[PDB]
PDB file of N, CA, C and O in Angstrom, chain B, residues numbered from 101:
ATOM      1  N   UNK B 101       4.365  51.089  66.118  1.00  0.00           N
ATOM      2  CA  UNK B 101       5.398  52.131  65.851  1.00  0.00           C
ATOM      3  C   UNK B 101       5.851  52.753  67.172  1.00  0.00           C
ATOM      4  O   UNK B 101       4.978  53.176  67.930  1.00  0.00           O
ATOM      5  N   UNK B 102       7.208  52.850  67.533  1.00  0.00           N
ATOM      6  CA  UNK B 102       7.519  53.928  68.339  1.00  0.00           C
ATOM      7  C   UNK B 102       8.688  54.752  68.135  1.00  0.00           C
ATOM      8  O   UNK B 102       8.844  55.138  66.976  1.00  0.00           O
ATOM      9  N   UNK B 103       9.603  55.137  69.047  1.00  0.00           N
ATOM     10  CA  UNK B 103      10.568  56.071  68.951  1.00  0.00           C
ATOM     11  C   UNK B 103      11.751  55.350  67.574  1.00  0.00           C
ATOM     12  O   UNK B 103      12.793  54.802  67.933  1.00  0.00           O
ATOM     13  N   UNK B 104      11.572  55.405  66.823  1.00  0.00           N
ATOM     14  CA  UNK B 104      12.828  54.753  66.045  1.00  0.00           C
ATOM     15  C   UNK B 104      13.116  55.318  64.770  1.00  0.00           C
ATOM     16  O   UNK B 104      12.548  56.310  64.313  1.00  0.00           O
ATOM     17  N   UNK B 105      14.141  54.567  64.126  1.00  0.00           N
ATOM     18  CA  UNK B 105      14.829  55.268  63.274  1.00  0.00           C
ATOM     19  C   UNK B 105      14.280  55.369  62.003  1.00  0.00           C
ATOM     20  O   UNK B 105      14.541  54.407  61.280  1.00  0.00           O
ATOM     21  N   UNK B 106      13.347  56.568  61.335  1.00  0.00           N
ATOM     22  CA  UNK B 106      12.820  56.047  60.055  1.00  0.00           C
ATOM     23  C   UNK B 106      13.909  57.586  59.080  1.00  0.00           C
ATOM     24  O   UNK B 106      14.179  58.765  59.311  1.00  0.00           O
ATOM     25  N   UNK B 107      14.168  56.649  58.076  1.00  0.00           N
ATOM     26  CA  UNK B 107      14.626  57.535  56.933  1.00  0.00           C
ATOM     27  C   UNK B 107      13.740  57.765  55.403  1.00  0.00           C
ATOM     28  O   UNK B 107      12.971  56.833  55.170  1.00  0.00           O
ATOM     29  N   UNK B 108      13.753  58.556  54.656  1.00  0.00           N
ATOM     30  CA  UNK B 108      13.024  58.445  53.607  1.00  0.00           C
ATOM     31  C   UNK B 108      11.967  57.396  53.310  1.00  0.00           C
ATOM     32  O   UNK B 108      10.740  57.389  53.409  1.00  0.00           O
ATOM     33  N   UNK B 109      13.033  56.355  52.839  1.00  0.00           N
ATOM     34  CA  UNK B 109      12.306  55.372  53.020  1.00  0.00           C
ATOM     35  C   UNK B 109      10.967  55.222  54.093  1.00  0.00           C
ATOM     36  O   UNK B 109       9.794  55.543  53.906  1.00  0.00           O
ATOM     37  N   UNK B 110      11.582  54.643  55.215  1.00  0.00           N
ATOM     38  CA  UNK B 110      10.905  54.261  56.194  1.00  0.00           C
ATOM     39  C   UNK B 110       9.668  55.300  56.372  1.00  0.00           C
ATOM     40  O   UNK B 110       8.517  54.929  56.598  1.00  0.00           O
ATOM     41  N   UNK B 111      10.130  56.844  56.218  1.00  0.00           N
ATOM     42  CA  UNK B 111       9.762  58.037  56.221  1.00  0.00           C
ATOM     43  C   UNK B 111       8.175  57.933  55.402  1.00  0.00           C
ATOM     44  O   UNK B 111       7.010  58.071  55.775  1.00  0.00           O
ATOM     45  N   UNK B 112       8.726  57.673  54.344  1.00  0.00           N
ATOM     46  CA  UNK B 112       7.505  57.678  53.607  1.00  0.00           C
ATOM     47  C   UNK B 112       5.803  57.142  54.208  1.00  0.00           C
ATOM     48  O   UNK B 112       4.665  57.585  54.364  1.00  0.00           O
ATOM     49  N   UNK B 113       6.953  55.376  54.451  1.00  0.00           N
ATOM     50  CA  UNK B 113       5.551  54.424  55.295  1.00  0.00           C
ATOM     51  C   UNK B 113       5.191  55.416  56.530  1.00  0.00           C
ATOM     52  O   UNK B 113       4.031  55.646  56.871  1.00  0.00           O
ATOM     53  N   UNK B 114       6.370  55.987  57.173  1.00  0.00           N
ATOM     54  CA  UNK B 114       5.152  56.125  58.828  1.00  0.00           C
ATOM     55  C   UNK B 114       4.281  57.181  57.984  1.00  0.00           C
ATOM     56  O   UNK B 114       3.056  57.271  58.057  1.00  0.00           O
ATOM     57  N   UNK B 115       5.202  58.041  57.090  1.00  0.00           N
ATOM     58  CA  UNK B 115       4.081  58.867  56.703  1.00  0.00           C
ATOM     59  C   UNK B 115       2.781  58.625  56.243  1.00  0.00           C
ATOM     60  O   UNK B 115       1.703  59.191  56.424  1.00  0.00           O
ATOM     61  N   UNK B 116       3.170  57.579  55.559  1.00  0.00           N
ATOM     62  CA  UNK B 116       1.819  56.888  54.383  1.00  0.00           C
ATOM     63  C   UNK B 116       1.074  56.104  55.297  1.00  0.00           C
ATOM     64  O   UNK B 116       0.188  55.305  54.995  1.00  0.00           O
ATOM     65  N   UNK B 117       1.505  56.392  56.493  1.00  0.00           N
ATOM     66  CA  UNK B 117       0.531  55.574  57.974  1.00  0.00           C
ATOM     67  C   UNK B 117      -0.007  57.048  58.079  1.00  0.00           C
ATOM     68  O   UNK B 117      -1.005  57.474  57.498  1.00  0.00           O
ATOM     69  N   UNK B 118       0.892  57.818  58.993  1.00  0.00           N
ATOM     70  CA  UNK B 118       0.233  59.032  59.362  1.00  0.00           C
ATOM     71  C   UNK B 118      -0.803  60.037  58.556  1.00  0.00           C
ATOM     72  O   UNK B 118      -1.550  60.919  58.979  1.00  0.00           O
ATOM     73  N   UNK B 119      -0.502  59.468  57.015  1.00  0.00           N
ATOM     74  CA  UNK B 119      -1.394  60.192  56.545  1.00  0.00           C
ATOM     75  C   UNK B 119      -2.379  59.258  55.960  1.00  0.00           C
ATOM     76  O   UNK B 119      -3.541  59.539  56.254  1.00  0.00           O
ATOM     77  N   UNK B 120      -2.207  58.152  55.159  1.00  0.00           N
ATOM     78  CA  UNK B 120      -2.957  57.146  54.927  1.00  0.00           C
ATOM     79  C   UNK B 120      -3.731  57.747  53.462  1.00  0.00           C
ATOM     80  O   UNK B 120      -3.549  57.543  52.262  1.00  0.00           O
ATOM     81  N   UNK B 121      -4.601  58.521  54.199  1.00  0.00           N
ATOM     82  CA  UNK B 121      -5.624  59.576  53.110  1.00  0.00           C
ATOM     83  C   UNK B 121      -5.655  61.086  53.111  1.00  0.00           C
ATOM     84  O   UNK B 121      -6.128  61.939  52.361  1.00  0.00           O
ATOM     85  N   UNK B 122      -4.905  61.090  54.345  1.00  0.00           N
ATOM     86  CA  UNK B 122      -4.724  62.993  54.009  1.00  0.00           C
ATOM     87  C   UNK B 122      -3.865  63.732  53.254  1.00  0.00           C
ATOM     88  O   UNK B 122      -3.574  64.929  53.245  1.00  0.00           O
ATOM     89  N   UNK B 123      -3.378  62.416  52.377  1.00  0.00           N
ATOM     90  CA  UNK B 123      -2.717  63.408  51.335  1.00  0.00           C
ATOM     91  C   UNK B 123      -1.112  64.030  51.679  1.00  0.00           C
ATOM     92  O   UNK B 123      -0.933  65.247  51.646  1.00  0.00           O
ATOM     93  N   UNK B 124      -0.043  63.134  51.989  1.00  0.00           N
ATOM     94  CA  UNK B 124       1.153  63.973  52.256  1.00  0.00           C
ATOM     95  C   UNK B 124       1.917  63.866  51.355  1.00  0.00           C
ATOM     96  O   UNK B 124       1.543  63.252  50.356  1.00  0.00           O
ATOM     97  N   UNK B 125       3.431  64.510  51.417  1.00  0.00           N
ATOM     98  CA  UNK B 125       3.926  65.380  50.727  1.00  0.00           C
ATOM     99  C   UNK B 125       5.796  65.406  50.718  1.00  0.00           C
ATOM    100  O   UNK B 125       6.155  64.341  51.222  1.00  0.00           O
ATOM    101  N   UNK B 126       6.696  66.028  50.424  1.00  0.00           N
ATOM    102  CA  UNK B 126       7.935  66.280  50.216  1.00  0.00           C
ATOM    103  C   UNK B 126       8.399  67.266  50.914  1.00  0.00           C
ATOM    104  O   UNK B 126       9.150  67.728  50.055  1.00  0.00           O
ATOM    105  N   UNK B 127       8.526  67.909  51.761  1.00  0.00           N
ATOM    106  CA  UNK B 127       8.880  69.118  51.731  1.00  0.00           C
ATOM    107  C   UNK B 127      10.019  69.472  51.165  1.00  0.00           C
ATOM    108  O   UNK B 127      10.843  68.565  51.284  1.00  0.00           O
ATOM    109  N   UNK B 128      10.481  70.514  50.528  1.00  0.00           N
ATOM    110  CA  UNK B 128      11.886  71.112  50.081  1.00  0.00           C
ATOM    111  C   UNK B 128      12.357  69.582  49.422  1.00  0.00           C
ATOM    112  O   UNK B 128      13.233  68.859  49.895  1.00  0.00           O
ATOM    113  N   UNK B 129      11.473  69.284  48.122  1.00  0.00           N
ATOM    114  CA  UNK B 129      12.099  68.664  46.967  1.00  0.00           C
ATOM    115  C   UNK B 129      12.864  69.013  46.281  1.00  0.00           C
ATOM    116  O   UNK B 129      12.570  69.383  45.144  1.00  0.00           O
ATOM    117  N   UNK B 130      14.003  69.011  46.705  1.00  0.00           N
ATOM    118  CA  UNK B 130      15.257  69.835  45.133  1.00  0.00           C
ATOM    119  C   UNK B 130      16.790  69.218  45.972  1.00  0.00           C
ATOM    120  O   UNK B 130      17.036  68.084  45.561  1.00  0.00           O
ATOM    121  N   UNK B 131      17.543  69.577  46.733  1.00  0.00           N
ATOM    122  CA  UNK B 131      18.442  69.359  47.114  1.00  0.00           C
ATOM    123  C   UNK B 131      18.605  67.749  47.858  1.00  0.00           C
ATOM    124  O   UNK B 131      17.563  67.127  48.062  1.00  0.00           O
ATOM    125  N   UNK B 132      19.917  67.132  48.239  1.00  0.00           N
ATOM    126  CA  UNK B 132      19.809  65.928  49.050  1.00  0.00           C
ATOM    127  C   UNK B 132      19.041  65.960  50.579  1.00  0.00           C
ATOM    128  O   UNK B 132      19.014  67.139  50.931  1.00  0.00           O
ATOM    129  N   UNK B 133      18.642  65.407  51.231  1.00  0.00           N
ATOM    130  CA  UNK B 133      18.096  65.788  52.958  1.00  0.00           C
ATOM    131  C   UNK B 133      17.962  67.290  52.720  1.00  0.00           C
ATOM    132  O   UNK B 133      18.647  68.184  53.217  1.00  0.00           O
ATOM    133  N   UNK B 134      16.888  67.398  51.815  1.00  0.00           N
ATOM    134  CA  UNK B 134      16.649  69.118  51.498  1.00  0.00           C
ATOM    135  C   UNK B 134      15.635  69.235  53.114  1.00  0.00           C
ATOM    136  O   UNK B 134      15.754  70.192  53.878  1.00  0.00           O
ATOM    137  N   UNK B 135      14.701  68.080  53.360  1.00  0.00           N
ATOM    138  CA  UNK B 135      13.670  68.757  54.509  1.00  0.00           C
ATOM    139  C   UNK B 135      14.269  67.576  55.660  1.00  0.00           C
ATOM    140  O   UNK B 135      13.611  66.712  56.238  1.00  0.00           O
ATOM    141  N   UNK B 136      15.800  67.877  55.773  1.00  0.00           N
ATOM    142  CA  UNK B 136      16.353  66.974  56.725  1.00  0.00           C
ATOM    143  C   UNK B 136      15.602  67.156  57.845  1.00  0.00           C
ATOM    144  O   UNK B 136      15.386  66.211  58.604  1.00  0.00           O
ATOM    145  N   UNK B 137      15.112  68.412  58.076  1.00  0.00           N
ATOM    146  CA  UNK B 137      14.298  68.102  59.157  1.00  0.00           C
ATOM    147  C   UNK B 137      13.238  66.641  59.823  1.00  0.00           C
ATOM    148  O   UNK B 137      12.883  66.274  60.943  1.00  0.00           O
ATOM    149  N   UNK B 138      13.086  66.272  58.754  1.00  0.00           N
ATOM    150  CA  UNK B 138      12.427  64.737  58.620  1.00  0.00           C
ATOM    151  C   UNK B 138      13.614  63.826  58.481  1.00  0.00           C
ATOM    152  O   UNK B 138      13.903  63.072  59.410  1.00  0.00           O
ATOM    153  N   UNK B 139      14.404  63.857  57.238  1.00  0.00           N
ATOM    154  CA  UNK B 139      15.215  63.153  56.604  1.00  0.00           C
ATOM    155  C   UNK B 139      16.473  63.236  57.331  1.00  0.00           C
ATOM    156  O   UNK B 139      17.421  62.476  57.129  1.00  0.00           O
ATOM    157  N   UNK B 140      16.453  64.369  58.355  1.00  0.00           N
ATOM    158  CA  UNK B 140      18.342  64.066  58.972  1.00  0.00           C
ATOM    159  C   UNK B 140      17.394  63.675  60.266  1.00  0.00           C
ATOM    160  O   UNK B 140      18.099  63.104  61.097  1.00  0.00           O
ATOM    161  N   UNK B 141      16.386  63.764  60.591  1.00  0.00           N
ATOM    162  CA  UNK B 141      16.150  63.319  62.327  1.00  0.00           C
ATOM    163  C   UNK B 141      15.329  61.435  62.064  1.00  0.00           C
ATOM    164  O   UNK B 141      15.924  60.357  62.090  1.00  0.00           O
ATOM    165  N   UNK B 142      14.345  61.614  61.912  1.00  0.00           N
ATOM    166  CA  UNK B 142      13.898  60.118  61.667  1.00  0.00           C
ATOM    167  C   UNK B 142      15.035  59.394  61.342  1.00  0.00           C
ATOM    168  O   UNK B 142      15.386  58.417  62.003  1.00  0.00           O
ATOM    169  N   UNK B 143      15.700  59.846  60.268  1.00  0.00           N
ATOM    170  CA  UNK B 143      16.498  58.697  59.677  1.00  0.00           C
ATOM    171  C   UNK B 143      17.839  58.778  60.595  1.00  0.00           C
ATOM    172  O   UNK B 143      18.295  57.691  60.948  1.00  0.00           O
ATOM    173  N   UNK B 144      18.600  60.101  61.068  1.00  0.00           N
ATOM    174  CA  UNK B 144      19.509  59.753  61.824  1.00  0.00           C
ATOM    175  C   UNK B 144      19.287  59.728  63.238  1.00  0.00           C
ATOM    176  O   UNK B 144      19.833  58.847  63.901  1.00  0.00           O
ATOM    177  N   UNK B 145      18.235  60.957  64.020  1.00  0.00           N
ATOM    178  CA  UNK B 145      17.158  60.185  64.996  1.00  0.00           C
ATOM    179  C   UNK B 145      16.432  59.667  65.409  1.00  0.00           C
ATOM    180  O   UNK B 145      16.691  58.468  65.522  1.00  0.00           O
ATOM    181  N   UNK B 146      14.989  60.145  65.948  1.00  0.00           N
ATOM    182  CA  UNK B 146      13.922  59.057  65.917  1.00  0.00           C
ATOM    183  C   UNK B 146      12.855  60.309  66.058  1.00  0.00           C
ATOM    184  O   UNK B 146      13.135  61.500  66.192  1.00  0.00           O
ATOM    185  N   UNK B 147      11.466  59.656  65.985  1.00  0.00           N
ATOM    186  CA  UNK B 147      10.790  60.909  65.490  1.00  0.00           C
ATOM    187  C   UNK B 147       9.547  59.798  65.715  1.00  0.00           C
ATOM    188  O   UNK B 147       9.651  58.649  65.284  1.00  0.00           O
ATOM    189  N   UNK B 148       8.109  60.374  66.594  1.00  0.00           N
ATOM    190  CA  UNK B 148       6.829  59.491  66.310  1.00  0.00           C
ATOM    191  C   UNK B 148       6.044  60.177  65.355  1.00  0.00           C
ATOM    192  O   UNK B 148       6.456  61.175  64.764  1.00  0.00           O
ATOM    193  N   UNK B 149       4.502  59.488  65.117  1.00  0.00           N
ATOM    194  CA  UNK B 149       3.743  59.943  64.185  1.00  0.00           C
ATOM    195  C   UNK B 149       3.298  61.357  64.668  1.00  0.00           C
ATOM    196  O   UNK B 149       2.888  62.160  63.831  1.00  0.00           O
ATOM    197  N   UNK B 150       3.334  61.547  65.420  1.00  0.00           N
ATOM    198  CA  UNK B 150       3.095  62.674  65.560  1.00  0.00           C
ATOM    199  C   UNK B 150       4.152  63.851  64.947  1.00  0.00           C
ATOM    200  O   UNK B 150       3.822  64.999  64.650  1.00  0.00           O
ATOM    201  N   UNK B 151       5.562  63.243  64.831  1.00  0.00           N
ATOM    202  CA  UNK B 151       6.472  64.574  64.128  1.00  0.00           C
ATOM    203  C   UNK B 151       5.792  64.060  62.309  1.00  0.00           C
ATOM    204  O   UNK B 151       5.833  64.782  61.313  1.00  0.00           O
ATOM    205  N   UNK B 152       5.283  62.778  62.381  1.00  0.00           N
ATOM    206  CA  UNK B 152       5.199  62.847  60.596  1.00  0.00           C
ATOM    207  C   UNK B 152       3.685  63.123  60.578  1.00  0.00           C
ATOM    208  O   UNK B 152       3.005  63.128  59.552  1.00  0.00           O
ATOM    209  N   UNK B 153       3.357  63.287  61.478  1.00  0.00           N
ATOM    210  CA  UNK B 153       1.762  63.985  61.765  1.00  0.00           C
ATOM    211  C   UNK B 153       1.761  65.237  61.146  1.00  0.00           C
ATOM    212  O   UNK B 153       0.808  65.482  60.407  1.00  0.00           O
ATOM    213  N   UNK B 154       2.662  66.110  61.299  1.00  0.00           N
ATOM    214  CA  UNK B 154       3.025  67.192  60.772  1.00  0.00           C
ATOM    215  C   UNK B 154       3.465  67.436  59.369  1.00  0.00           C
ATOM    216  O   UNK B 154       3.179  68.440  58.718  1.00  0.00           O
ATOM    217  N   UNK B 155       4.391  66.146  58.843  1.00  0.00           N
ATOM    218  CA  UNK B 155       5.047  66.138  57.301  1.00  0.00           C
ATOM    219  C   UNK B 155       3.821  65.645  56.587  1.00  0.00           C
ATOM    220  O   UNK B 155       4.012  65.372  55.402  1.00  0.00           O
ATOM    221  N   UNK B 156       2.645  65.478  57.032  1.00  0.00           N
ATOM    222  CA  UNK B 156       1.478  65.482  55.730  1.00  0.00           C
ATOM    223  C   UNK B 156       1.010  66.633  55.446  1.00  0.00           C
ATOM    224  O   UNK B 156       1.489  67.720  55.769  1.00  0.00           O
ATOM    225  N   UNK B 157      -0.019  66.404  54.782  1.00  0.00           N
ATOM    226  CA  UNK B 157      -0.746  67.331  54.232  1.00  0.00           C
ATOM    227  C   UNK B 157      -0.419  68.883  54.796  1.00  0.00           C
ATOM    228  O   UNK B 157      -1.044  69.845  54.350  1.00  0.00           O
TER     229      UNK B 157
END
């Protein structure tokens, strides 16, 4: 993995890497790119495990 483009999708796996077993999560489930913070940067920037280090648990 490095600097690249993950969206939801993709989002999910680095997450489901980054977290594996710790259990992660959605943030701000309700609206479209509600936690664009993940969903407008990974997917329209780039972001390492370490920013989805943060979107777990």
């Amino acid at each position: 993995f490095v600097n690249q483009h993950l969206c939801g999708s993709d989002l999910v796996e680095a997450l489901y890497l980054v977290c594996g077993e710790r259990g992660f999560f959605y943030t701000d489930p309700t609206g479209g790119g509600p936690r664009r913070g993940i969903v407008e940067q990974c997917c329209h920037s780039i972001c390492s495990l370490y920013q989805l280090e943060n979107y777990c648990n």
